[PDB]
Coordinates of C-alpha atoms in Angstrom, one line a residue:
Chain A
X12 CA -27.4 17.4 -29.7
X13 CA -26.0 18.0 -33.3
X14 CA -23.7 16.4 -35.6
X15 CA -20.3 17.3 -34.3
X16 CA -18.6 13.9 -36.6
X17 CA -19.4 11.4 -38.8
X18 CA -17.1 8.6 -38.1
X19 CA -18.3 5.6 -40.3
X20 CA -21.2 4.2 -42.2
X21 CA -22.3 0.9 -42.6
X22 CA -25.0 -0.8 -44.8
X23 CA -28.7 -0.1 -43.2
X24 CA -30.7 -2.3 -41.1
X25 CA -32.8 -4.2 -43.0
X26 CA -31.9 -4.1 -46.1
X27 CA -30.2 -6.6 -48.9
X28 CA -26.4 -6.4 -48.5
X29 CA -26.8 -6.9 -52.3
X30 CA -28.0 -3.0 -52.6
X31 CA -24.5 -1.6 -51.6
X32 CA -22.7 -4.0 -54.0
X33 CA -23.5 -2.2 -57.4
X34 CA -20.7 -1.7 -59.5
X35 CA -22.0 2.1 -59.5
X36 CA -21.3 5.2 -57.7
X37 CA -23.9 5.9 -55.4
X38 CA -26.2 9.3 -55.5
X39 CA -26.8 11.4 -52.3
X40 CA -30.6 9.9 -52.7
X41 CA -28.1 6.2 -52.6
X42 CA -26.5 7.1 -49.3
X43 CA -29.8 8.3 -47.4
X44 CA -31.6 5.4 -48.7
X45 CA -28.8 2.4 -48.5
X46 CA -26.5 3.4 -45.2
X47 CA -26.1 4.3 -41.8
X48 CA -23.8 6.5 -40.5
X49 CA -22.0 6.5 -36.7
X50 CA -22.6 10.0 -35.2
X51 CA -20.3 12.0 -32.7
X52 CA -22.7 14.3 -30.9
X53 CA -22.3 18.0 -30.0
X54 CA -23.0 17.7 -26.5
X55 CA -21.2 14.3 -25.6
X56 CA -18.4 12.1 -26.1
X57 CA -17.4 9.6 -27.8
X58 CA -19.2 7.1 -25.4
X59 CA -22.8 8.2 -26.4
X60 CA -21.7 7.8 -30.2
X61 CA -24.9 6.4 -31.9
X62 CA -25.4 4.8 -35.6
X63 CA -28.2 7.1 -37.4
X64 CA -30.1 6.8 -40.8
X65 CA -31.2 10.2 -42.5
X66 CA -34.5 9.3 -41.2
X67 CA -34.1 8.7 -37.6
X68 CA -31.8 11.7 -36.9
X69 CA -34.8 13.9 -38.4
X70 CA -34.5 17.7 -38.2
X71 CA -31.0 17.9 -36.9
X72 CA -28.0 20.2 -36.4
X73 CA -24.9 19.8 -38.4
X74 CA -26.4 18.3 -41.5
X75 CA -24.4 19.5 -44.1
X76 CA -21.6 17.2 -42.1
X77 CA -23.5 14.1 -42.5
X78 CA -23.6 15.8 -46.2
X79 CA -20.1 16.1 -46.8
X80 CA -19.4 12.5 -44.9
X81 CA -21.7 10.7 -47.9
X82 CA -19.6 13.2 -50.4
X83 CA -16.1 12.4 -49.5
X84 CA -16.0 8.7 -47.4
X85 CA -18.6 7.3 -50.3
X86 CA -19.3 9.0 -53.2
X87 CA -15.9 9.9 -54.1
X88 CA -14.6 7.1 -52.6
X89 CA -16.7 5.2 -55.4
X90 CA -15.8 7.2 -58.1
X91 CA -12.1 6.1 -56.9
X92 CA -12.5 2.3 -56.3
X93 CA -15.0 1.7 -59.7
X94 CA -12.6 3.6 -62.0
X95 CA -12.1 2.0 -65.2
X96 CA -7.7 3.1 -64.6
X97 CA -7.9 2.0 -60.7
X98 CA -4.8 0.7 -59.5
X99 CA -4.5 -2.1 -56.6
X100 CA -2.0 0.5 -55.2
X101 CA -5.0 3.0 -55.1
X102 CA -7.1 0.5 -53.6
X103 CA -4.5 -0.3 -50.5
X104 CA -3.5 3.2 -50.2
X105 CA -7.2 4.1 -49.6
X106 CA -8.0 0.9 -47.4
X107 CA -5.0 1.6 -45.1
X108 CA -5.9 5.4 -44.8
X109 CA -9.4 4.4 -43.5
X110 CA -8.6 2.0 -41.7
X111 CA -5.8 4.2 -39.7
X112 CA -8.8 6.8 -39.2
X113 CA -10.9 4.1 -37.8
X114 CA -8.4 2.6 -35.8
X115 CA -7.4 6.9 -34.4
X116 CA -11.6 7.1 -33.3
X117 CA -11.4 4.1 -31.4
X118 CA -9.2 5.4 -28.8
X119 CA -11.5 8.3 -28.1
X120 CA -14.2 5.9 -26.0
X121 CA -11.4 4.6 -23.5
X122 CA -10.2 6.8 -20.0
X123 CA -7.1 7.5 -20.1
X124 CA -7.9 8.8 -16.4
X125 CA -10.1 10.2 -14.5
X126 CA -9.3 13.9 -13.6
X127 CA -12.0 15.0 -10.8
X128 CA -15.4 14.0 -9.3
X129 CA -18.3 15.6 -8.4
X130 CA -21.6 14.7 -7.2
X131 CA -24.7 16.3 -8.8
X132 CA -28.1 16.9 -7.5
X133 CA -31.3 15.4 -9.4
X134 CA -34.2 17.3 -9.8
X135 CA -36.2 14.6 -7.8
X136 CA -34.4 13.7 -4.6
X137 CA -31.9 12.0 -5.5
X138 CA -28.3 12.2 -6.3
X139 CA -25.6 11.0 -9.0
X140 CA -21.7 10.7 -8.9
X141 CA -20.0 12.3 -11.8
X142 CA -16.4 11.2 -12.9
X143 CA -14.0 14.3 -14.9
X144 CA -12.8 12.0 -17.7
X145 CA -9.5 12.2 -19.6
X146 CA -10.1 10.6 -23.1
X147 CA -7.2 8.6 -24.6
X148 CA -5.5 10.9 -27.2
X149 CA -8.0 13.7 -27.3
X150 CA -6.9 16.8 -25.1
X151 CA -8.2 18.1 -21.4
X152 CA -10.1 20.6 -23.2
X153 CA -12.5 17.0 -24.5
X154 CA -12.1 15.4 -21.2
X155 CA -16.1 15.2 -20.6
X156 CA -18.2 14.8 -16.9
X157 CA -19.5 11.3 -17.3
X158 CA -21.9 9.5 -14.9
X159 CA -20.1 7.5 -12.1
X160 CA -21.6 3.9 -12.5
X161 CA -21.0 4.2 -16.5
X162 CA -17.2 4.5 -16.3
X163 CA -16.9 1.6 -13.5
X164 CA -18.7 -0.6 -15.9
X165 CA -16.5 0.7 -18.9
X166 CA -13.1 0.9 -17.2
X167 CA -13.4 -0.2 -13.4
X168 CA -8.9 -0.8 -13.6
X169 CA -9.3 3.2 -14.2
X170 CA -11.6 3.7 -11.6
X171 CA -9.8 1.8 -9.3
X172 CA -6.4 3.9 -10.0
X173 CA -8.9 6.4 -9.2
X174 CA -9.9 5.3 -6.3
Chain B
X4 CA -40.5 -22.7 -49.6
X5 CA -39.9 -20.5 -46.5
X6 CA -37.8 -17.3 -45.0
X7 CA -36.2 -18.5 -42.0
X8 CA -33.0 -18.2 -40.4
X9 CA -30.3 -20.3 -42.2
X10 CA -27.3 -19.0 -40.2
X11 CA -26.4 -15.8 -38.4
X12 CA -23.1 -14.7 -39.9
X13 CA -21.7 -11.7 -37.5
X14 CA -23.2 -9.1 -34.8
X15 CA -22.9 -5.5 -34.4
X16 CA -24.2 -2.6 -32.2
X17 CA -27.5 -1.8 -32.7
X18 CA -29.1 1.3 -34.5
X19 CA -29.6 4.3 -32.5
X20 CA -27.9 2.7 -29.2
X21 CA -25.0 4.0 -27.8
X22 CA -21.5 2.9 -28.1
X23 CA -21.2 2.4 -24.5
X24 CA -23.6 -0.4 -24.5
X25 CA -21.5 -3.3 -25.7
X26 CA -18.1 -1.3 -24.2
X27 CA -18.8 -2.7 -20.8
X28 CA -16.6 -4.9 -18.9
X29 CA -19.0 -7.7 -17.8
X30 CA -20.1 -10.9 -19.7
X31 CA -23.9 -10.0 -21.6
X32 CA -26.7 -12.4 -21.2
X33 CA -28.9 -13.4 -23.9
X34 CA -31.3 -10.1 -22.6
X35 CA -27.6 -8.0 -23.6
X36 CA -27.8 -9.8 -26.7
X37 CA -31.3 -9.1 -28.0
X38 CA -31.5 -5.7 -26.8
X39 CA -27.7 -4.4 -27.8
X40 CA -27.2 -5.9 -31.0
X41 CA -27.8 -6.4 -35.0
X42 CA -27.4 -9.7 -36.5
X43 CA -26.6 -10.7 -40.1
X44 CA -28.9 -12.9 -41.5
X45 CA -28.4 -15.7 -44.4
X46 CA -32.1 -16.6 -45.3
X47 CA -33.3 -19.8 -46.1
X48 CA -34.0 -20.5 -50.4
X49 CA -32.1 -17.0 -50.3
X50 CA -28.4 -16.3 -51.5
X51 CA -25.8 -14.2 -49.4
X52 CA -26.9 -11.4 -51.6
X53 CA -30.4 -11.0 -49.7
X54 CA -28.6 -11.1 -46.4
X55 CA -30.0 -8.5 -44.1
X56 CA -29.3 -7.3 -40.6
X57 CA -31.9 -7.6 -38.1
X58 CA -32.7 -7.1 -34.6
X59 CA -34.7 -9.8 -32.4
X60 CA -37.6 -7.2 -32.7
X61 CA -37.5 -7.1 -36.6
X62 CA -37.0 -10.7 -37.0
X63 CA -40.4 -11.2 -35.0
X64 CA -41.6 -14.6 -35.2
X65 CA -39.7 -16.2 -37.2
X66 CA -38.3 -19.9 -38.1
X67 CA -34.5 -21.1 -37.3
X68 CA -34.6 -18.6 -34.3
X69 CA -32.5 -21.5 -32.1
X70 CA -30.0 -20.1 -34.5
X71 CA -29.6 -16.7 -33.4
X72 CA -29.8 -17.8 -29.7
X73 CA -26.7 -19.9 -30.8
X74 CA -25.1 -17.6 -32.7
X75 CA -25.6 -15.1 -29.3
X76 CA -24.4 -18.0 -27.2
X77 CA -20.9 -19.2 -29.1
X78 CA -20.0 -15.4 -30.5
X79 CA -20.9 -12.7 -28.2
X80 CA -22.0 -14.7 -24.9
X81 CA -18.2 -17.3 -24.6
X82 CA -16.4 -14.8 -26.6
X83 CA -16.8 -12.4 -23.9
X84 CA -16.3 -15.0 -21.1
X85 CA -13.1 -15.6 -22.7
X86 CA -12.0 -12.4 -23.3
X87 CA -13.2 -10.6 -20.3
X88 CA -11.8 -13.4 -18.1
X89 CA -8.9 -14.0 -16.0
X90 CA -6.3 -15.6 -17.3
X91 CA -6.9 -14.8 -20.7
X92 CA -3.5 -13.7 -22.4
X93 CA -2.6 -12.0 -25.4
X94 CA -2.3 -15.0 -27.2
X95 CA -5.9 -16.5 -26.8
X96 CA -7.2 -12.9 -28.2
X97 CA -4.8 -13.1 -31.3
X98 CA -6.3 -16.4 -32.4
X99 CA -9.5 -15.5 -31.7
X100 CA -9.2 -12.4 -33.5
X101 CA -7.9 -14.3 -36.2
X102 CA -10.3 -17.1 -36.0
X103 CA -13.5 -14.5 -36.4
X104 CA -11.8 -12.6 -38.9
X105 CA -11.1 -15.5 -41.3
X106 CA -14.6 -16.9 -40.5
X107 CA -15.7 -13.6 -41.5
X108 CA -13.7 -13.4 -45.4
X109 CA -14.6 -16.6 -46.2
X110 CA -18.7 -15.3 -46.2
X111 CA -17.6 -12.4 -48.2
X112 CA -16.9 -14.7 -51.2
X113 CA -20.0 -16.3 -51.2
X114 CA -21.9 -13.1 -52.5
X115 CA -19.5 -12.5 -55.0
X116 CA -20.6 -14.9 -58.4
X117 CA -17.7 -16.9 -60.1
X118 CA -20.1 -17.7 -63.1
X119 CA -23.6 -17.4 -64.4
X120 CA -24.2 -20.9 -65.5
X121 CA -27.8 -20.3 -67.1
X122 CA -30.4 -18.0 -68.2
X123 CA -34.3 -18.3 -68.0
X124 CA -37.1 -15.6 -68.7
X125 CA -39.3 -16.0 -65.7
X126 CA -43.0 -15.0 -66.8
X127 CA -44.7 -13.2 -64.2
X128 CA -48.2 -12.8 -62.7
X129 CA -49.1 -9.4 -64.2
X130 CA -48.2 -10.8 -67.9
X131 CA -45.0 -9.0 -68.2
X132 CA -41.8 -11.3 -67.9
X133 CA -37.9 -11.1 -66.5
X134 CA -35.0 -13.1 -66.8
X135 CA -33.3 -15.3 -64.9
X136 CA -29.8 -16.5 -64.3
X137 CA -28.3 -19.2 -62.5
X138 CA -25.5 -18.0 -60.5
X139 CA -22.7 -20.5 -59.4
X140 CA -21.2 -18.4 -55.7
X141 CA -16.8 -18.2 -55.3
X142 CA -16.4 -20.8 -52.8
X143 CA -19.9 -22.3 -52.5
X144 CA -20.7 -24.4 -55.2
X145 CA -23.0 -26.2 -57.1
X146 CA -26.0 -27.0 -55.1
X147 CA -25.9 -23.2 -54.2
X148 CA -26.4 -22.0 -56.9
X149 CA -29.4 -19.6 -57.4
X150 CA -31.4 -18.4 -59.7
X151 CA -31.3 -14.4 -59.2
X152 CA -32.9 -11.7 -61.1
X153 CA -30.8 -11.2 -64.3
X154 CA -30.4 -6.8 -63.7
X155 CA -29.1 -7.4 -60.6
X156 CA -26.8 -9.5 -62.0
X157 CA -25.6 -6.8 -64.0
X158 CA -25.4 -3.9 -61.1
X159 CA -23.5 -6.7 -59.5
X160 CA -21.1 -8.6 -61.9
X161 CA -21.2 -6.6 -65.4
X162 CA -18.1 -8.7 -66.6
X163 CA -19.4 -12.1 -65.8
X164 CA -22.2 -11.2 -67.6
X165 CA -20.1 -10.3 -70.4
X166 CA -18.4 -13.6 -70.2
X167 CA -21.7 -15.2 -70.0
X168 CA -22.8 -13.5 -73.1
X169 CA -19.9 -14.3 -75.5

């Protein structure tokens, strides 16, 4: 349970949206302090994607990711959109090329099919029915063993084709 | 004189939940609502530049809370009726799409100031003192005005303070 991505940040719970509307670039201090940040796991798919501050992800994995995120997506970003010599050009070109990365990650929590199932056995008694899951546009080698009842509740059409 | 709910401007998943949560094909209930989500909050005798996202549990006991089970009703609770329904086509998505998303740009003005219209020192408890300006919001107008700290004024709009100062 590392950072495998950072996908996105938003402005932290909490807090003044006034605090991430400085005409200044943000420090790394800035970024830990003002934002949180939608994390891809190691061990899981897109569907178990969680937002995260600094502080509640703790003593983690894959830091110098969440690192590089804040370094490149805001930071430079920053130093980009509050030049002085900015152009609106600049501005569109940089809007369009995160929205299309945004838009990309957002077809990596829907089936595309489901591939195989298998039921496991729960240390108690009890037993749970897995679902082999093809992601859309990510390859078999990220299709991921999900829990049964999650994906009927997610994509039942899928489930159905399934049967 | 009070911090209360004034209106609930947009929703979004909630920290440290996962995504899953609000990807499900079935209609929340107000429960859904309070447990899955983040609301953005305009604050009573505050501007849209104090607004802060909260969950039901931050928010504790708080006045205008009616609000927010509105807010939870008309945009998460019908929206999802709607879309999750029968019978919808692609047509009724567009224009609700369209609808939210101009609801949502019109808001963004509103923290953004079209002119600082006065200043004031404001002389505090501890003897020291700060200054004050009266900030007129794009799109608002005139009975919305606030008075806001002057520096964050600066951080926020350095060239209507310039124009301010001429």
């Amino acid at each position: 349970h590392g950072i495998d991505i950072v996908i996105n940040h938003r402005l932290k719970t909490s807090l003044e949206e006034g605090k991430v509307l400085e005409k200044t670039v943000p420090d790394l201090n800035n970024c830990k302090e003002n934002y949180e940040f939608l994390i891809k796991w190691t061990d899981e798919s897109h569907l178990h994607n969680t937002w995260e501050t600094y502080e509640s992800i703790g003593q983690v994995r894959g830091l110098k990711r969440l690192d590089n995120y804040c370094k490149q997506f805001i930071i430079e970003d920053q130093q980009v959109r509050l030049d002085p010599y900015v152009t609106a050009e600049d501005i569109e070109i940089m809007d369009m090329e995160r929205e299309r990365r945004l838009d990309e990650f957002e077809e990596f929590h829907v089936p595309e099919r489901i591939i195989d199932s298998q039921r496991a056995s729960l240390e108690d008694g009890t037993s749970q029915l897995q679902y082999l899951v093809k992601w859309r546009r990510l390859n078999y080698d990220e299709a991921t063993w999900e829990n049964a009842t999650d994906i009927v509740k997610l994509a039942p059409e899928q489930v159905k084709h399934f049967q």
